[PDB]
Amino acid sequence: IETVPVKLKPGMDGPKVKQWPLTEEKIKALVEICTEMEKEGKISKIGPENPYNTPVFAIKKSTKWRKLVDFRELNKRTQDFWEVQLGIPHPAGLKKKKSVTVLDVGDAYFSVPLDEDFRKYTAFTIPSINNETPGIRYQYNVLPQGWKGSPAIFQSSMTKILEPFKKQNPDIVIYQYMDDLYVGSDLEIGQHRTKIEELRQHLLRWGLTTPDELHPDKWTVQPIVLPEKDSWTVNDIQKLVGKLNWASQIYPGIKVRQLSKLLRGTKALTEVIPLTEEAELELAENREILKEPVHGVYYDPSKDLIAEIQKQGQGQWTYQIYQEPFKNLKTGKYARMRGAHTNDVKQLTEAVQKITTESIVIWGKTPKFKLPIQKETWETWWTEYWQATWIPEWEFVNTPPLVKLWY
Amino acid sequence: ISPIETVPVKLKPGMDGPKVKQWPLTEEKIKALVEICTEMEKEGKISKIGPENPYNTPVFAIKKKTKWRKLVDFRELNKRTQDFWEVQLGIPHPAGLKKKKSVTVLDVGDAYFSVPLDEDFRKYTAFTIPSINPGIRYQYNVLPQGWKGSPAIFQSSMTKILEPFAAQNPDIVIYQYMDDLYVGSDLEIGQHRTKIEELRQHLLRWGLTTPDKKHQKEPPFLWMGYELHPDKWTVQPIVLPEKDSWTVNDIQKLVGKLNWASQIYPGIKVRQLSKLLRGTKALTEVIPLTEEAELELAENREILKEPVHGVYYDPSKDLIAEIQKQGQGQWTYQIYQEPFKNLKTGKYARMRGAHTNDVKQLTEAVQKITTESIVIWGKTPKFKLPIQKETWETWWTEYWQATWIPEWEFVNTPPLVKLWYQLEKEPIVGAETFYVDGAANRETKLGKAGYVTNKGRQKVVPLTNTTNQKTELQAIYLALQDSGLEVNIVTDSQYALGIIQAQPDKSESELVNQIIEQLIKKEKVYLAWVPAHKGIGGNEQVDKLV
Numbered sequence: 001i002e003t004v005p006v007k008l009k010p011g012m013d014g015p016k017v018k019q020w021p022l023t024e025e026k027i028k029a030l031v032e033i034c035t036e037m038e039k040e041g042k043i044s045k046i047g048p049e050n051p052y053n054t055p056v057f058a059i060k061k062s063t064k065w066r067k068l069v070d071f072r073e074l075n076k077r078t079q080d081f082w083e084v085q086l087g088i089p090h091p092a093g094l095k096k097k098k099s100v101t102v103l104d105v106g107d108a109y110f111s112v113p114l115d116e117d118f119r120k121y122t123a124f125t126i127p128s129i130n131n132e133t134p135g136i137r138y139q140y141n142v143l144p145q146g147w148k149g150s151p152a153i154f155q156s157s158m159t160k161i162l163e164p165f166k167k168q169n170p171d172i173v174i175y176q177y178m179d180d181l182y183v184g185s186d187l188e189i190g191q192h193r194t195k196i197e198e199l200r201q202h203l204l205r206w207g208l209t210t211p212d213e214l215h216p217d218k219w220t221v222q223p224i225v226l227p228e229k230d231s232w233t234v235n236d237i238q239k240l241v242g243k244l245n246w247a248s249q250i251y252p253g254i255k256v257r258q259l260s261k262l263l264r265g266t267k268a269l270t271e272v273i274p275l276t277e278e279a280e281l282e283l284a285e286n287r288e289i290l291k292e293p294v295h296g297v298y299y300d301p302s303k304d305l306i307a308e309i310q311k312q313g314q315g316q317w318t319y320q321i322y323q324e325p326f327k328n329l330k331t332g333k334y335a336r337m338r339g340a341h342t343n344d345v346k347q348l349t350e351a352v353q354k355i356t357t358e359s360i361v362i363w364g365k366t367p368k369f370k371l372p373i374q375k376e377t378w379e380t381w382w383t384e385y386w387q388a389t390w391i392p393e394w395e396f397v398n399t400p401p402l403v404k405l406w407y
Numbered sequence: 408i409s410p411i412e413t414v415p416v417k418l419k420p421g422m423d424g425p426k427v428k429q430w431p432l433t434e435e436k437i438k439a440l441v442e443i444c445t446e447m448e449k450e451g452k453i454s455k456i457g458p459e460n461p462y463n464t465p466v467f468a469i470k471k472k473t474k475w476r477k478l479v480d481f482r483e484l485n486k487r488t489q490d491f492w493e494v495q496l497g498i499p500h501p502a503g504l505k506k507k508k509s510v511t512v513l514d515v516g517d518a519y520f521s522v523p524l525d526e527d528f529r530k531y532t533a534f535t536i537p538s539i540n541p542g543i544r545y546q547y548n549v550l551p552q553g554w555k556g557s558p559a560i561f562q563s564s565m566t567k568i569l570e571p572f573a574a575q576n577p578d579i580v581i582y583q584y585m586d587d588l589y590v591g592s593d594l595e596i597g598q599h600r601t602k603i604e605e606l607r608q609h610l611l612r613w614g615l616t617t618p619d620k621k622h623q624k625e626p627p628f629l630w631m632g633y634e635l636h637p638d639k640w641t642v643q644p645i646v647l648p649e650k651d652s653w654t655v656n657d658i659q660k661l662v663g664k665l666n667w668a669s670q671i672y673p674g675i676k677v678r679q680l681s682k683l684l685r686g687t688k689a690l691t692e693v694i695p696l697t698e699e700a701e702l703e704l705a706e707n708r709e710i711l712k713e714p715v716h717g718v719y720y721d722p723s724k725d726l727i728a729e730i731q732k733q734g735q736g737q738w739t740y741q742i743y744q745e746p747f748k749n750l751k752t753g754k755y756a757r758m759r760g761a762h763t764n765d766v767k768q769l770t771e772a773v774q775k776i777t778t779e780s781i782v783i784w785g786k787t788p789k790f791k792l793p794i795q796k797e798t799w800e801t802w803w804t805e806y807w808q809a810t811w812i813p814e815w816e817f818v819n820t821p822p823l824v825k826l827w828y829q830l831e832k833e834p835i836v837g838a839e840t841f842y843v844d845g846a847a848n849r850e851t852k853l854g855k856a857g858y859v860t861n862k863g864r865q866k867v868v869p870l871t872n873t874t875n876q877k878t879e880l881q882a883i884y885l886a887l888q889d890s891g892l893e894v895n896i897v898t899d900s901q902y903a904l905g906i907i908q909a910q911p912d913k914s915e916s917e918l919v920n921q922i923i924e925q926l927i928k929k930e931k932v933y934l935a936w937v938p939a940h941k942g943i944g945g946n947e948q949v950d951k952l953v
């Protein structure tokens with residue numbers, strides 16, 4: 001197999017990212033994993049004249065250890081010229097299918113040799129404990145998983161293998177982000193799960209192994225809910241006027257002038273106020289403008305996506321994906337169900353993973369998260385529930401919400 | 408001098424080798440220089456060159472701390488050479504070593520000149536000895552001193568040279584570090600002293616001198632500002648100077664020695680001393696000392712009066728860390744496997760953020776400790792913590808951030824960690840309702856604070872030297888002073904609602920501290936927010952008054 005030559009955007013040097021300190025147990029797994037990989041030829045040890053680095057993590061895919069490499073920085077310095085040169089185009093029909101299964105085709109890439117001159121930028125380090133020894137240094141010889149260039153370069157083979165199945169099933173959508181195939185149908189869950197096993201077998205009998213379901217039918221911007229109460233108070237009309245005043249930044253056709261006169265004198269907080277004719281009229285007129293979606297909100301394929309998450313309590317977290325302030329392209333709420341075997345970081349981690357998949361299905365790119373968590377805390381435990389092969393970008397919003405209940 | 412395989416080296420892309428002009432220097436040294444070039448050329452570490460593709464680098468000389476020495480300034484070649492992997496930034500921490508009966512410290516001499524230089528790269532190390540007028544034209548064949556590539560290449564060479572000797576002796580353990588090797592073994596002193604002799608004979612077959620046992624160092628070991636003792640470790644003797652005036656420089660060098668000692672001497676406090684350093688001015692001004700700073704330093708002198716020690720690590724024993732409060736936003740921890748001997752100690756201070764509370768600082772301390780245990784021992788400890796389950800369950804349920812709390816057991820040692828108050832989450836029935844507001848003028852900086860209550864009560868207080876921020880908390884403080892043990896405050900300012908709902912128990916502002924004192928006294932407080940200037944009923948009045 002001849003090698004596809006690979007070039008960074010000119011004036012860009014290779015990545016040099018610090019390796020994160022690891023548990024002894026995790027270091028053992030990497031050294032085991034990497035010893036097998038050196039034998040099968042996939043990676044090789046390197047010298048001190050290779051200055052680049054890329055972090056390595058150890059996750060659990062299971063009772064066996066998978067290795068995960070954080071190619072985020074090397075993706076920015078090469079693939080940004082490989083969304084253009086060898087880019088994989090995104091079908092806007094996939095979000096509209098009733099069911100969507102996700103298949104892991106990451107093994108394919110490991111057969112294909114990597115351009116000899118590019119290998120130096122795949123360098124990574126297995127760290128040692130207590131700086132006992134400079135770590136073990138490796139670089140790749142095959143198409144590495146998690147690099148965004150592996151599926152660009154393997155596209156032609158993948159298009160060829162898939163096409164006999166695309167012919168038999170012209171109504172199935174197959175999309176490839178990184179190391180994963182998204183297959184979306186309109187079949188009944190029974191027939192969808194059949195077709196998927198057909199594709200799994202077609203794939204397996206062409207030499208492509210995969211380990212052995214979403215429904216983007218209720219994926220829209222969830223509407224703002226005004227609490228419906230049988231009786232009201234001074235406090236409840238203050239909470240109501242405060243919410244509607246904030247919504248006026250989103251739906252500018254909201255009038256609160258009628259509800260605010262309804263508590264005219266300085267009155268005790270718990271004092272019960274019945275509402276006038278013009279009050280319920282301002283309440284119901286505002287309920288109809290708040291169940292109908294926004295005007296002017298369009299995906300921009302040049303700006304980044306941004307996902308903000310807020311903690312709600314009792315295993316509930318709500319999220320908002322936008323590109324400009326207040327023009328929310330998508331909103332939702334995620335709830336776990338892991339009893340008392342669920343903790344705050346398990347729940348936030350699954351939230352991030354679920355948000356990133358919805359983002360991939362809808363737009364073919366992942367957001368950058370504004371995460372509510374101490375930075376060092378996240379840099380320590382995120383890998384304990386990370387089941388995915390990609391890694392989104394994130395920063396840490398140490399500023400609190402103060403809003404919360406408004407979502 | 409070594410048969411080591413060279414490491415290929417390039418120049419930074421689209422650059423070329425250093426072409427500098429040698430300055431005329433005093434002949435007293437020029438002849439002192441050739442007594443080095445010939446005695447180096449005879450050992451092969453350089454070689455004379457002709458006029459072919461000559462770049463040049465300057466060269467100097469100076470006396471000795473008896474034998475004049477040579478200097479080559481590679482500051483220009485260094486700029487043009489490729490980049491290399493970075494040599495070990497950190498070092499092992501003695502808390503983390505595991506005792507090995509016999510330990511031997513070998514320092515290889517001539518280390519960079521024992522290692523050869525990649526052939527096609529030698530021509531860019533060319534340098535020239537002058538005359539009065541021709542000139543001697545040399546170049547290097549080994550890793551030149553103070554070249555950018557020398558440390559990382561030498562480290563890798565040495566590592567490769569050890570590799571066959573380790574594969575024969577899996578019994579013994581070698582730590583590498585700069586030009587030193589530290590060899591430890593659970594071998595009886597005769598087997599150990601024989602193995603060390605095998606090693607030195609191995610290294611000399613690759614061209615690497617090592618000291619003879621007449622020169623082998625002996626414990627205690629003074630390494631990287633430590634005292635390494637056969638069963639215990641500690642820092643070097645600390646010396647705190649006694650000066651009348653104190654330079655901004657002088658304060659830096661003291662908070663230095665003090666932080667260093669906190670690894671092992673428990674109790675060191677460094678808050679007030681670096682509060683003085685918050686001047687951030689340049690480094691000769693004589694900063695005056697405060698009384699609290701003068702007290703803290705006194706207390707540190709009383710810890711440092713006696714000497715204290717640390718044990719080494721034992722992988723068969725559990726890892727336990729303990730945390731105790733010191734009140735001033737200052738926390739302290741000891742890490743031990745045995746209750747009379749610590750592995751190490753240390754402190755944590757929340758010098759980030761203007762308002763905080765104790766539980767959040769406790770959590771941040773647990774976090775510092777977990778990062779550090781991973782670095783040093785490859786695991787996390789079991790925590791002995793001065794706080795109770797019902798306290799912590801309550802805070803991390805009601806917190807906005809996600810938090811991760813390891814298994815911990817409650818050690819009942821005062822001062823404990825508690826929640827000193829909690830805001831009500833729904834308005835209090837049968838409590839007055841204060842509609843506070845406040846306002847100030849950005850130029851005059853006069854402003855005012857007042858409230859209006861549902862019971863017809865009304866106050867207004869004038870302020871001087873304030874801000875819309877100060878006077879908005881001043882309104883709330885006013886409603887607290889003037890009310891029952893249960894009170895319903897209603898405010899229009901997001902800033903003031905932000906501080907309070909964070910539920911701090913300590914702050915920089917005395918205003919916020921006074922508000923905290925009032926909230927601890929109250930028996931129930933409900934705080935509530937309404938949009939400012941939205942004619943809601945209640946605020947409108949205050950705004951007028953204020």
Ligand SMILES: N#Cc1cc2c(Oc3ccccc3OCCC(=O)NCC(F)F)cccn2c1
Nearest residue numbers: 504505506507510589590591628630635636637
């Ligand atoms: N000058 C100097 C010097 C010596 C060492 C050092 O010693 C060791 C060398 C090999 C294996 C284990 C070692 O320590 C185990 C605990 C122990 O007992 N150490 C020696 C003390 F008891 F003397 C380790 C790290 C840096 N060093 C710097």
